[PDB]
Design a protein around this ligand. Structure first.
Ligand SMILES: Nc1ncnc2c1ncn2[C@@H]1O[C@H](COP(=O)(O)OP(=O)(O)OP(=O)(O)O)[C@@H](O)[C@H]1O
Ligand SMILES: [Mg+2]
Length: 829
């Protein structure tokens, strides 16, 4: 009745968000993916541009710092004597093979594709063309704009006056299973009342009751629950949690069967009255739980406290000894280990901190309470507060800040963030929706707005929301959000996402068919199971879900295979629809949850962004991984790369040195002195980044199989089964690795560089301790093995040592490296 009205009101606001995004505005409706950029502190590069009319592409050297706009008319100056009548605004640059367009107002160096090519030393192949020739099949139409949002596939009393006690009678649970009446004797509910993800009072337990007489489908309590709180004392974003328990029969402890969460105030600030039905899920099973709230002759509405139109100016009383203690906690890493006496102090001296905006999350966490009376003073500060850094504002979208005025203000500051930065943070933003109690929020409208204006964000949101549907508690919410995204995306995007969904469903079928057969059968099973994928590609041309810029037209069946390890992963080899492009090699794995692999890769990618933004390039391998369902997805295959194991055993056959397996492997593919030197250098930098990442994220499962090495010399992790396992040498540097770093059997200045890079990097991550703790905090509700409590964050905070300064931290990590060497540590200084 009110929930169907909330869905109706959501749709109407989404219908008027669509009005801001007409199909005519190419800016927000291009029809193509933008090649992603990560701003880098600014070097020459050779680029190979294909031009219409020319049979050979023009190859010239560009300044890395120079903008794509001038590189486009550098390429036009090569073909045309004078560009007075060529229409320079007509033209764009796209990556050869990949349906992604370079951003005209960004440096060539900024683009991820240019950064990657430079690292591998591969040829930068671009194509000069006009948006007329550029594929715009994903573009929204006039039909999509005019189309409505479907989303599917009298007397009032103000709350602050309401002295009535919060009470409700848990009536009954309906439709219990046959295996429930089998196992459990009696059932009881535990009722808890929370705000800012924290209990207001201890949870009240219901009486233990069996199934109702002559009705084994029904549990009837009909018990009145009374909390020791008035309606006036309830914050707006108050939530009632009901967990059902079942005591087992003598044929252990009581088992948690399911959870339910009711908002005491609805989306129009009216207190929940009369009978309300909530649905808890178990096994595909739908259990209806009835809660009867009081129903007086009047509706109780929440009204915010009258605004405090106050400006605190600028002359304030200054004490010098408090100034020291205040700026000490203002420049503290985070609000994590902040003690009670530190909070009361900051809260008292909060109005002195107005020239350090990024310390607001420390102030709001220091608040004594969120009582109705004490909200006026909080809103007064908030609405006169300077704008926060988007990455700082992330903390205000966590569980511990449920207030709508804080969250709505956090999202308003967030609008300052770029699409390219947001794109890599989307998983945390999707989880943050769980802390929005109302369907229609500032956060969901923000995400839908960016999804409309950027096809890479919309594409990423699709797969993240599709994974979030499997949440038993929040699957209902994400259903409505994904329906809003798909509806607003348009026919073009929808029809393409459907082709991607069918491909993964077919790749899923073959993947589990392959693992379910015998060794002799497997090769024949794959070749026959891939015929249904061969059929798919002859009626459809599909974009790779992992990287939707790549369009596959056909499968290279004879090149397709399996990796012959645990889970028997597939090696899907597709041919590019673009002849200018190259073969598409991806892995599809089934059985393993690839979300914790996704988080590890994300954290390593953010580390790389932080380093590159401070001018430190550790030449890191950043490969993609996407979860396309429950315990299945596809992983980017890094080309010309093997595990340290295979390299150590294959050159332990030929050599009895067991000191130069990695060295003689790199010399095989890098024979010239300068080629081996650049390969050894690539190793030093990539190894330093891996050692830092290994320690901070806590990955002790780094052995010869789990570490991989590219032929160019770049080291990178592949397995992330162990992650945040700080329950323990953290990383290991073998005699093989040391020999490559030194460039000899004795220590050189190249090891001092490796040590300098490690410590320098370690400190640049310590500077962003708050971001990492916030990004890992927001992924807690995802439900990943070893990221469940807030104590799991402390382990990462301890690794980052925010207490120490860069001097002491350098000494610590330098002793980590000396410990890492172990046996051969004696040789070094
Ligand atoms: N991102 C990648 N790029 C290139 N090759 C990869 C990548 N990920 C895995 N591989 C290759 O695929 C092989 C099998 O991968 P898989 O994930 O099954 O290995 P694992 O998790 O280390 O081992 P297991 O699954 O048997 O416990 C690896 O040994 C490696 O050679
Ligand atoms: Mg694995």
């Amino acid at each position: 009745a009110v929930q169907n009205d909330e869905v109706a009101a959501f749709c109407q606001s989404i219908m008027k968000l669509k009005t801001k995004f007409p199909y005519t505005d190419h800016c927000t409706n291009p029809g193509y993916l933008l090649s992603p950029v990560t701003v880098q502190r600014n070097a020459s590069v050779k680029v190979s541009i294909e031009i219409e009319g020319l049979q050979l592409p023009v190859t010239f050297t560009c300044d890395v710092s120079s903008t794509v706009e001038i590189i486009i008319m550098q390429a036009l100056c090569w073909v045309h004597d004078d560009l007075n009548q060529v229409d320079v605004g007509s033209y764009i640059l796209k990556v050869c093979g990949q349906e992604e367009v370079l951003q005209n107002n960004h440096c060539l160096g900024s683009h991820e594709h240019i950064q990657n090519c430079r690292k591998w030393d591969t040829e930068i192949k671009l194509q000069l063309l006009t948006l007329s020739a550029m594929c715009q099949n994903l573009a929204r139409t006039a039909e999509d704009d005019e189309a409505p949002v479907d989303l599917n596939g009298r007397n009032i009393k103000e709350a602050w006056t309401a002295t009535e006690q919060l009470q409700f009678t848990v009536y009954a649970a309906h439709g219990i299973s046959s295996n429930w009446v089998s196992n459990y004797e009696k059932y009881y509910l535990i009722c808890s009342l929370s705000h800012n993800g924290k209990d207001l009072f201890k949870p009240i337990q219901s009486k233990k009751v069996g199934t109702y007489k002559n009705a084994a489908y029904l549990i009837k309590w009909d018990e009145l629950i009374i909390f020791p709180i008035q309606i006036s004392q309830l914050p707006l974003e108050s939530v009632l949690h009901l967990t059902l328990f079942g005591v087992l029969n003598q044929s252990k402890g009581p088992e948690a069967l399911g959870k339910v969460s009711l908002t005491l105030f609805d989306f129009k600030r009216f207190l929940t009255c009369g009978t309300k039905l909530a649905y808890l899920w178990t096994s595909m099973e739908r259990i209806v739980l009835q809660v009867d709230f009081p129903s007086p002759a009047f509706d109780i509405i929440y009204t915010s406290p009258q605004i405090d139109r106050n400006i605190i100016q600028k002359l304030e009383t200054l004490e010098s000894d408090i100034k020291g203690k205040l700026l000490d906690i203002i420049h503290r890493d985070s609000s994590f280990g902040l003690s009670k006496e530190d909070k009361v102090f900051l809260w008292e001296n909060r109005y002195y901190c107005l020239k350090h905006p990024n310390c607001l999350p420390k102030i709001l966490a220091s608040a004594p309470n969120w009582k109705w009376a004490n909200l006026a003073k909080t809103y007064s500060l908030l609405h006169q507060w300077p704008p926060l850094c988007p990455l700082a504002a992330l903390e205000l979208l966590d569980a511990k800040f449920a207030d709508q005025e804080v969250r709505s203000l956090a999202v308003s500051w967030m609008e300052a963030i770029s699409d390219d930065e947001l794109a890599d943070l989307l998983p945390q933003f999707v989880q943050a929706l769980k802390y929005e109690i109302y369907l229609n929020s500032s956060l969901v409208r923000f995400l839908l707005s960016r999804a409309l204006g950027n096809i890479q964000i919309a594409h990423s949101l699709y797969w993240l929301l599709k994974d979030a549907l499997h949440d038993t508690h929040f699957g209902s919410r994400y259903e409505h959000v994904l329906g809003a995204l798909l509806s607003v995306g348009g026919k073009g995007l929808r029809e393409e996402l459907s082709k991607q969904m069918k491909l993964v469903q077919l790749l899923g079928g073959v993947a589990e068919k392959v693992r379910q057969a015998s060794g002799s059968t497997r090769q024949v099973v794959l070749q026959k199971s891939m015929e249904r994928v061969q059929s798919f590609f002859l009626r459809n041309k599909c974009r790779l879900p992992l990287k939707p810029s790549l369009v596959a037209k056909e499968l290279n069946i004879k090149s397709c295979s399996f990796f012959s390890s645990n889970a028997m992963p597939l090696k899907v080899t597709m041919v590019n629809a673009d002849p200018l492009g190259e073969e598409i090699n991806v892995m599809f794995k089934v059985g393993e949850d690839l979300r914790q692999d996704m988080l590890a890769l994300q954290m390593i990618k953010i580390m790389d962004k932080i380093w590159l933004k401070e001018g430190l390039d550790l030449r890191m391998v950043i490969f993609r991984c996407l979860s396309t369902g429950r315990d299945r997805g596809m992983v980017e295959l890094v080309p010309a790369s093997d595990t340290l194991r295979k390299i150590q055993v294959e050159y332990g056959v030929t050599g009895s040195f067991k000191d130069k397996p990695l060295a003689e492997w790199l010399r095989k593919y890098n024979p010239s002195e300068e080629e081996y030197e650049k390969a050894s250098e690539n190793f030093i930098y990539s190894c330093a980044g891996c050692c830092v990442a290994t320690y901070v994220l806590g990955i002790c499962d780094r052995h010869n199989d789990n570490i991989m090495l590219r032929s160019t010399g770049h080291m990178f992790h592949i397995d992330f089964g162990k992650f945040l396992g700080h329950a323990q040498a953290p990383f290991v540097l073998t005699s093989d690795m040391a020999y490559v770093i030194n460039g000899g059997e004795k220590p050189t200045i190249r090891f001092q560089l490796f040590v300098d890079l490690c410590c320098q990097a370690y400190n640049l991550i310590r500077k962003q301790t708050n971001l990492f703790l916030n990004l890992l905090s927001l992924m807690i509700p995802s439900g990943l093995p070893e990221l469940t409590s807030i104590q799991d964050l402390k382990y990462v905070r301890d690794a980052l040592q925010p207490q120490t300064t860069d001097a002491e931290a350098t000494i610590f990590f330098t002793r980590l490296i000396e410990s890492s060497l172990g046996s051969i540590a004696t040789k070094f200084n």
